[PDB]
């Protein structure tokens with residue numbers, strides 16, 4: 001048990017599509033800031049906590065499945081829900097947390113410390129800390145700007161360095177003090193623009209599915225990624241005004257290295273897409289979705305790749321990633337976007353280890 | 360027991376927010392077409408079937424709750440799911456129907472006849488049959504045009520008389536033969552434009568919530584219904600092209616009387632809204648939303664009207680209904696919109712009683 005020799009906490013990412021339990025061990029430096037953070041246990045379950053019926057039977061079963069086979073107990077737990085919970089009013093969220101609090105009070109293996117919904121701005125701060133902790137860019141002053149994107153199921157986050165600015169909402173700026181260095185970040189989360197929520201606006205768009213895919217309305221797919229991308233861009237920009245919010249800020253505060261986490265790592269690592277060095281460009285992502293999925297015959301393609309439950313969505317998702325990054329954020333189609341390998345189980349929860357405060 | 364002397368079937372509306380069981384008795388005319396349709400049992404449950412975990416324990420608890428206390432069971436059952444289920448790919452929908460079929464086979468009473476997902480176009484035909492059945496406009500040729508809107512949680516339907524147009528998809532037209540008359544209808548369903556799915560694009564729009572309502576992002580509501588409406592219109596028209604699809608048809612095929620079912624009946628019948636004769640105008644809907652919700656201080660208003668779970672959403676919903684009907688469908692803001700009183704339990708299921716065929 002590493003936790004007899006190191007500090008350990010458990011942090012649960014209660015995401016829109018599923019929850020991920022992590023147990024982390026760590027030591028601390030002379031200011032009591034964590035270092036040597038190691039994941040010693042992981043467990044993921046589906047579906048999203050905020051999608052299940054909020055009654056005792058259902059919540060008991062879900063929590064029991066998530067937690068019950070961990071090799072290490074008697075450790076503090078931080079349960080933090082994200083955009084799936086944010087879709088619900090406080091009073092519905094309350095049903096979940098009252099039931100959760102009760103389940104923890106009824107047992108003795110886990111010590112619940114916090115269980116609450118964090119804002120997309122909190123989540124975006126944690127997204128940047130987690131990635132930059134793994135890149136070891138936190139201990140010393142960097143001479144390059146690292147931006148992070150988290151491609152979630154219900155919201156997407158963007159976060160990048162930006163000097164403190166009297167003209168931008170205080171909620172979209174964070175002054176972070178860590179390892180003796182002062183870091184100022186712009187943060188934004190776009191609720192409804194995560195892959196599940198976005199997709200619900202395009203399921204009858206023939207351009208967004210392979211040829212002959214059966215759309216729910218009875219029409220047929222007729223895929224064309226640039227056309228699908230244009231439809232998604234309408235939601236990005238005509239509805240959410242992503243471009244007007246984010247592009248002027250990126251123009252003034254350029255990002256040298258972009259890192260992405262969330263669903264895009266899984267798409268880019270699938271059998272259908274081909275990228276080297278765990279990185280992509282939006283130009284290649286759109287090309288590959290267009291020709292590998294959109295313009296293919298659905299039943300033939302589905303028969304060739306039977307084991308991928310996301311296959312039917314790849315025309316829409318490649319198009320959507322491009323719409324978000326290129327037409328929303330203004331990122332050049334030729335710019336490299338690194339993505340963290342899925343095997344790494346990297347989500348924003350490392351950020352909670354390093355930084356316990358919330359908005 | 361009515362069912363000893365009259366034909367009875369059970370029809371379940373498995374909607375996105377809940378399921379409604381109806382047992383209908385009826386007689387038939389000389390062509391075996393139902394007449395004297397009466398609801399003899401109703402039970403409603405939440406949440407929507409396509410929201411719950413598709414496992415044996417969860418599905419059996421949900422079906423038991425919906426069906427077990429029905430006071431007549433040896434009758435044919437039709438279980439028809441709508442837009443909630445259409446958000447999921449066929450492979451996920453199959454997990455639900457496989458479990459549901461198994462549950463029916465573990466009892467000997469209900470004769471399950473069909474359990475399947477119907478298209479939005481089927482649903483729109485049944486919406487028009489159900490309302491016109493109640494208005495007694497089916498047995499004779501009408502000299503006026505009756506249009507129906509169903510304001511659902513995941514999709515909205517619109518349906519109205521229109522002669523065959525060879526330039527419009529076959530999927531959006533139905534040639535209906537009922538009571539010896541031939542009726543040609545235009546049908547359309549807009550997936551993702553139902554109240555629940557729409558709302559997930561505007562939860563951090565301050566214009567769509569009462570003053571100081573706590574938005575999930577940490578910002579404050581600052582309601583203004585015209586402004587909220589314009590945001591929703593961008594989703595109606597810039598994204599879904601509702602205007603371009605519907606207005607040219609209604610221009611050439613005007614509707615004389617509009618009837619609505621779905622959530623708008625509940626909103627219009629609430630304590631916050633004031634309408635006479637079970638009818639509204641969009642101009643009065645928007646003005647009442649603006650003044651009675653959008654421009655009120657949230658804590659004050661919430662304290663005044665504690666018993667209404669939808670109150671927080673009424674600035675958004677009033678603006679949304681106006682965006683859909685006026686800016687999307689092109690209906691004049693002073694045109695009367697009849698809504699069916701909620702206590703009538705009217706949904707599209709009476710259409711299934713009348714017309715068993717699907718597309």
Ligand SMILES: Nc1ncnc2c1ncn2[C@@H]1O[C@H](COP(=O)(O)O)[C@@H](O)[C@H]1O
Pocket residue numbers: 017018044151152153195262263264266267268270310317
């Ligand atoms: N092959 C894939 N393509 C796109 N998105 C994916 C894929 N696999 C998983 N996701 C999404 O990736 C996120 C993280 O998934 P997981 O680590 O499996 O919970 C969720 O939003 C999933 O819906």
Ligand SMILES: Nc1ncnc2c1ncn2[C@@H]1O[C@H](COP(=O)(O)O)[C@@H](O)[C@H]1O
Pocket residue numbers: 376377403510511512554621622623625626629669676
């Ligand atoms: N007061 C209300 N305002 C707006 N929508 C409502 C209200 N009450 C119920 N609904 C919606 O009306 C539809 C039918 O509700 P029910 O008859 O309660 O299943 C669902 O989409 C509900 O979410």
Ligand SMILES: [Cl-]
Pocket residue numbers: 204216217218445478479480548550
């Ligand atoms: Cl549909």
Ligand SMILES: [Cl-]
Pocket residue numbers: 086119120121189191563575576577
């Ligand atoms: Cl948020």
Ligand SMILES: [Mg+2]
Pocket residue numbers: 015016082152153262347
């Ligand atoms: Mg996430």
Ligand SMILES: [Mg+2]
Pocket residue numbers: 471472
């Ligand atoms: Mg059979």
Ligand SMILES: [Mg+2]
Pocket residue numbers: 374375441511512706
């Ligand atoms: Mg419905």
